[PDB]
Scaffold this active site. Structure first.
Site, PDB file in Angstrom:
ATOM      1  N   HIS B  40       0.795  -1.217   0.000  1.00 23.62           N
ATOM      2  CA  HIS B  40       0.000   0.000   0.000  1.00 23.62           C
ATOM      3  C   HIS B  40       0.834   1.276   0.000  1.00 23.62           C
ATOM      4  CE1 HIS B  40       0.017  -0.316   4.620  1.00 23.62           C
ATOM      5  NE2 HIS B  40       0.268   0.969   4.453  1.00 23.62           N
ATOM      6  N   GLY B 142       3.063   5.790  10.082  1.00 27.74           N
ATOM      7  CA  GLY B 142       4.403   5.628   9.562  1.00 27.74           C
ATOM      8  C   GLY B 142       5.095   4.346   9.969  1.00 27.74           C
ATOM      9  N   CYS B 144       4.124   1.181   9.289  1.00 27.57           N
ATOM     10  CA  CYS B 144       3.980   0.051   8.388  1.00 27.57           C
ATOM     11  C   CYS B 144       5.328  -0.347   7.799  1.00 27.57           C
ATOM     12  CB  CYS B 144       2.987   0.375   7.284  1.00 27.57           C
ATOM     13  SG  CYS B 144       1.313   0.378   7.968  1.00 27.57           S
TER      14      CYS B 144
END
Ligand SMILES: *[C@H](O)[C@H](C[C@@H]1CCNC1=O)NC(=O)[C@H](CC(C)C)NC(=O)OC[C@H]1C[C@@H]1C1CCCCC1
Lengths: 299, 301
Positions: B40, B142, B144
């Site tokens: 993503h 932030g 991920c």
């Protein structure tokens, strides 16, 4: 979410070595061309009951100390003692030395521990320096010389080196100048600590964290004065709360819109009544090893 | 007397990078000449709804991906999608690559999470994979691309990469092959986890830990079949045991001489009768986030 979180340990792992003298092996910290380790590495089983360290050390030479960084042996070219720490000078500089400093930590402050065995990092976890200057760690045989530290913008501040376990299962050690935290001594004897008290500013920070993450059953509409709260805290063997503690808790109070002294009234209710079988952030006990700063850097 | 203790994180710190598409930056894992990260990263805010990942990727070229170790750019020379992870081939093999493997863990297994932001490690902590395939992390925006791992000797087994937060505040993600744990998808939608249950195998490990430390009031002189225990356990929102659970309790059973099924009988009595104000290892609560391996690591190792 809110989790007890240790600093990333890589900068300290690159400094851990094994130190052996006689039949005794523990860990050392290798910074630049010096290795720091607990001086009791020089004791035998017979020495440990009442060691005359200056006398035991004068009878040692450089070649009696075996230092290993992994498969590599470091040559000891000099040695000295600073309080309860030995400093072994070696011919090799550690290329992985980080920017660092030695600090003496205040009771109630937290640090990360890198537990090591035979010079090899094994685990990492967060500890608080208790008011009675013990730490509730996880340390087995061979863990001595493991260090505690904080990290601030690539600078490693070393504050703890591990030396012993007390009969109650808690732990004791020194700063990196070799001075013990607490009334303890590096001899093989059963030592008791002073009565341990609870770190109140940290309990308050953790209640604020339980509120941020949606847990509110303990709050109340009531309030209290600072002195009146402190009378109840001292009754329950909690440390007194200072105005600086209140100030320190400011950011957390603003974020949640709960006056510090309103949270004090909630804690007072918890101390006088209890949990009622309930839990806070998963715990059935009030947690006191999160500092305000620890909580803030997480929400 | 037990600490949640993470593995030393240095071997993983040496693999963390950041990956940016447009203004979206998350973390990636740099092993040999491949960087792994959540797919993503290629989404804009408006794509998050139900992104068309295949379409979004076809618009992408190697030169749209900004990969950095610190402030040092790593040139991307190939890209592909594997399930919910992006694999970015880079022109430099990571000199700090450890011995490693990619494993898919089971519910109940624990692992260390190295929480990272902008490719920079922030903290390390232990997580347990819940039976409903969530973990209780501390992840902010932030985070991920932060990974979870175990270390066996010198080998890093990567088992988790972080992708999302659920309405209840728990976290969800994938293995390093991009396969989500549990029934979640990488879309910006409210998704529900199944109701959670107690990790029976870890509770048993905790009872064994108590016995090892001389706290054994709860041992009884009975046993049970595995099926009978599982049927009772389910009525208390405990997980049923698998054959693999029985096997991984083997070392603690051998250490204590208490057969697994006998310990199951003691647990059954605690569930049916309660603790009666007694404590085990100092608590009235039964702990379920220490695996049998975790117990051996803190008691004997
Ligand atoms: C160093 O690796 C080791 C670490 C301890 C061992 C077990 N868990 C730890 O954290 N430190 C020691 O063994 C010190 C050494 C002395 C010279 C400072 N001693 C120690 O920790 O003893 C443990 C006390 C419980 C033991 C006492 C029982 C009654 C007789 C005297 C010892």
């Amino acid at each position: 979410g809110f989790r007890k979180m240790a600093f990333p340990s890589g900068k300290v792992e690159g400094c851990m070595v094994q130190v052996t003298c006689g039949t005794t092996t523990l860990n050392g910290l290798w910074l630049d061309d010096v290795v720091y380790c607990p001086r009791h590495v020089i004791c035998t089983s017979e020495d440990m009951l009442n060691p005359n360290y200056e006398d035991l050390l004068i009878r040692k030479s450089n070649h009696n100390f075996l230092v290993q960084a992994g498969n590599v042996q470091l040559r000891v070219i000099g040695h000295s003692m600073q309080n309860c720490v030995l400093k072994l000078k070696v011919d090799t500089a550690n290329p992985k030395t980080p920017k660092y400093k030695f600090v003496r930590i205040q009771p109630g402050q937290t640090f990360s521990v890198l537990a090591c065995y035979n010079g090899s990092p094994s685990g990492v976890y967060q500890c608080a320096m208790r008011p009675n200057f013990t730490i509730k760690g996880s340390f087995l045989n061979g863990s001595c010389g493991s260090v505690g530290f904080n990290i601030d913008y690539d600078c490693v501040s070393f504050c703890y080196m591990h030396h012993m376990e007390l009969p109650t299962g808690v732990h004791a050690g020194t700063d990196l100048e070799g001075n013990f935290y607490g009334p303890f001594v590096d001899r093989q004897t059963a030592q008791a600590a002073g009565t341990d008290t609870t770190i109140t500013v940290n309990v308050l920070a953790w209640l604020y964290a339980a509120v941020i993450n949606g847990d509110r059953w303990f709050l109340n509409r009531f309030t209290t004065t600072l002195n009146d709260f402190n009378l109840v805290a001292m009754k329950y063997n909690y440390e007194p709360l200072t105005q600086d503690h209140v100030d320190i808790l400011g950011p957390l109070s603003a974020q949640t819109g709960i006056a510090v002294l309103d949270m004090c009234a909630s804690l007072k209710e918890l101390l006088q009544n209890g949990m009622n079988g309930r839990t806070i952030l998963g715990s059935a006990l009030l947690e006191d090893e999160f500092t305000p700063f620890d909580v803030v850097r997480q929400c």
